Amino acid sequence: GNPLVYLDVDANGKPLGRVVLELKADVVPKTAENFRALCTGEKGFGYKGSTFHRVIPSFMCQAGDFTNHNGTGGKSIYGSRFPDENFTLKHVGPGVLSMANAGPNTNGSQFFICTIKTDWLDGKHVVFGHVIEGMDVVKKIESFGSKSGRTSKKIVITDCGQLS
Amino acid sequence: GNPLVYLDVDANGKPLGRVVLELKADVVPKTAENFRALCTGEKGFGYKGSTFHRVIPSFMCQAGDFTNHNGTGGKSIYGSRFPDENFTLKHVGPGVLSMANAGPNTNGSQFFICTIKTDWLDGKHVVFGHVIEGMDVVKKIESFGSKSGRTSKKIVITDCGQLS
Amino acid sequence: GNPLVYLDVDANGKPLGRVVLELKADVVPKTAENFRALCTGEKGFGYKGSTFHRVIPSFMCQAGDFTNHNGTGGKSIYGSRFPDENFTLKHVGPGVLSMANAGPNTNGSQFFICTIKTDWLDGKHVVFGHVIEGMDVVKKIESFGSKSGRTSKKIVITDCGQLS
What we know:
Chains A, B, C: It is found in: Mitochondrion matrix. Chains A, B, C: This is Peptidyl-prolyl cis-trans isomerase F, mitochondrial. The first copy, chain A, is an alpha+beta fold. Chain A is built from two helices and eight strands. An eight-stranded antiparallel sheet of chain A has the order 3-4-6-5-7-2-1-8. Chain A has helices spanning about 30-40, 135-145, and strands at about 5-10, 15-25, 50-55, 60-65, 95-100, 110-115, 125-135, 155-164. The N and C termini of chain A lie close together (about 10 Å). Chain A has a single domain (about 1-164), classed as Cyclophilin (Beta Barrel), CATH 2.40.100.10. Chains in contact: A-B, A-C, B-C.
């Protein structure tokens, strides 16, 4: 079945709760597997202890730069970058999980969770999962964002992994 | 296993004892390796001869500015500064070993040992170890501090290195 | 009469208002002159366009690092550092203007405005002025601080100068 993963998130050292994500391995297996392995850390690197570095209210919460924490870094389990797998899944509404990128075929480790429908990203960012529990935690993260993307409290993934 | 390092600490030339620290190289290998090599002095520079220049009772004891000896300097084995590796470990209580900084991604050589839980630093300073022996020596250091951070005696790391 | 100088302060690009400071040139002329000239910019450098980089509620608001914007830098009009002129004035309450330092006789350009009586700093930091207008602006700045000193908004001195 599709892997289930979780992120436990703090704001300024205080727990916000747990986000559970379904990864659509049945549609984008390569993209799902990368995110799964980065949640478990089984390759020797991953999301544990990294941050949500860009949060824009009424848009999305972005994370996954575990090398530079500033949106320039991260890497996939396949290498620095990997190709766009397909564009089957759409940014249909809040809770959609999608790959951040620098244009086509630049998927690494950075990802975002939408807080609204962002159909203007369809065909540009590969969607690969969705929140199945803890959307209220995502709304908490969103509440600390700004138009500049900078956060008013520091948002840290204190734990993550696969539930199996 | 994780590296164990030691700090031998003086106060106005009177030995206070030895602090033994476990460095969590299994969680923050880059940050642990910097501190380890600064204890041995194997790169030609390190903590030997530097002071605990800022000691605030019921907060922390800060040391490691072996260049300017006043809290403005220091340097890592990787250059002047290196990024925050991760925020996996927390300032859970007395004895936590953590990096001083000047904001995100500014780690050098200065460090602090907590004497209380400082969860309001979680996410801002990279935790990378803890005291496993000689917490009574840390409390002795703390007793020479003040609210201003100024010490009433010159607190010197007379020796340091790795236990193996 | 003692100089009057001002700082106009933004938080995230929104004006907070003006802080007007009286500089106690009658007690600490060399320290007052440094701050006055850094407000006017007449030496070719100074506070305009720099930030409040450390704000701790129920303590103080710190600024003045116009070289590094992070608390490691700044310089005086006399050189990198100048001595403690005297400790005649005390940290008597909110609105006190005092020099940050890195230990005895290391004043540069960094300064702080107290939001409480900080008498534990008497004899360690040179007091040289006080707020005469805009303590409400200082309290606004204070409200964007945290125990870690990190601010929840970017606090910028957008203008500064001498009034009389």
